[PDB]
Amino acid sequence: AAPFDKSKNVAQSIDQLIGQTPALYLNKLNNTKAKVVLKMECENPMASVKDRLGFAIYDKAEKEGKLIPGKSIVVESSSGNTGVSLAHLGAIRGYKVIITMPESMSLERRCLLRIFGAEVILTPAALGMKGAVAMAKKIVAANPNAVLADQFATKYNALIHEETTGPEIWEQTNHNVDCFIAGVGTGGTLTGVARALKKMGSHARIVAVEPTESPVLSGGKPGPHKIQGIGPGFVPDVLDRSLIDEVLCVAGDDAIETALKLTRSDGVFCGFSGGANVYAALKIAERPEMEGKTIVTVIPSFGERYLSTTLYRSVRDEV
Amino acid sequence: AAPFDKSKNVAQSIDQLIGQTPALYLNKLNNTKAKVVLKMECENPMASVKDRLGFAIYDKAEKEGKLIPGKSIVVESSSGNTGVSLAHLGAIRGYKVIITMPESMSLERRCLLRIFGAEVILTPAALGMKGAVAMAKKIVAANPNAVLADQFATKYNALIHEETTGPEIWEQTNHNVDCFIAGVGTGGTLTGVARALKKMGSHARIVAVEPTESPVLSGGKPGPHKIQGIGPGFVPDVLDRSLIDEVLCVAGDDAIETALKLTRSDGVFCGFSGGANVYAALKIAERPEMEGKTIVTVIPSFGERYLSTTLYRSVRDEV
Amino acid sequence: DWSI
């Protein structure tokens, strides 16, 4: 990390507040005989797990000599949390950041990035995320100083989770993990935590979650789905499939139901993907072999970012 | 508290994640010869300092026998963070919560409360916050089981800050505070921290901030202003004025400018009142007597809650 | 005005 008790010292920069997040037992929602522990990545300073990947890319690339503040331009295609965390850290590190995303995206997504002074390049709506990806590649191809964050392939991504997320989990659960479950977006969280757990001698079963409507790891066809943050519709190079014991599909509507229930049951307020992870954890926890075992999963992002999405439409409609 | 290293243990409930927040030096924005330390109350689990007051009211009232889960109904008039924190903790504690607020409030304010299953009673727009206050009083007067949170008078409010916020600050700054500055909403944060600091032997100067456009502590007339979270337009019973060395007015537009600058300079993303607190801290830090001294202030709430307000309209317009 |  190195470990740094935030509750007892004054940080020199906001990036020292990233990681070392809390862990929380699922209680009222957990009606099973297994313990379920939630790694609260929603509590990062920009409210999601991507703060760890942002920091890892800036810190490790600079240290290796591949980024130079005020010269390098960091470019990425993202209509979600990676673009936020890149924009937030690029600002305080003196990098120009360009994020591409379709024209059709909500004012909130565009506006949050411009607060942190990122340049947002909007691509034609009809081309979808493919069009935003192509624009980011062309920008980086044309300009020597422009480089791709490359969230889906960068070696920094699994590495940060192996060095931080996974050893935090290990200490918090007192070296006791029987199953680790995470939705795969880039695959960094699952891959890095699975690496750390195995290095510590844990026999935890490693479970990857994906949307039923885009079941790519399971061998099916990519498609549009609701579970923001996971399910890219290809197998990311970051993901090391050799570490996975089971791929479990979760339907977007089970994720959405579970998110709504979690707020009221346990006070956990998250996005679609924390609903999918908890649905999957509870499913595993019902398996009779898991009686008395400890299941760990992740709450990737805080709910306030999703107030305008399909996630809480049922509440919106009700209001 | 008691102290509980969240980074090394698994919490049994989300309310154990409240408080023990980080502290962060102001860096690029601080061009002065004084140190400025930001107490990061934006990092609470429901993203503001009111999580401490919510917990204190539920915990201390139950312990004293004044609240009984499933019987007591907690009522409060709030179109800001107190209503959020009351709604969030009431849900997981098995209290019905009723929050009153004018009809004219944004869908976000109403919807965030209904996510946590609070009842929101909307009062006529033309009556403003006075109408919402009157409705909360009538509800509590009419129903024996309905009680007012009473954020502006409750003894729990300064007490929680004296027991937690103030001793955290003391440990984080290594027992070195020359000035503590906070905007007064209910006055709890300033009063409790000032009490703790004085009990520890600190000679810190205690500075209360209020909006220039509603300069009540300064002896002027109440009026509408922009600085959400502070400036109630009366002197709250919680506030102990005997502890205050200086009342400093900050104009709503200086608060708004400072908030926008803080995101880009230091990566701190907050509401109007964290802009006003930082503006005030920087003003004090310019005073020649403060050379080499440590000034502490507060970032009361995270910025994402304000994305729809006047605060970031300049960015919204730009986008 | 106030929002607290």
Add this chain to the structure above:
Amino acid sequence: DWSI
């Protein structure tokens, strides 16, 4: 689809 995807938003990451």
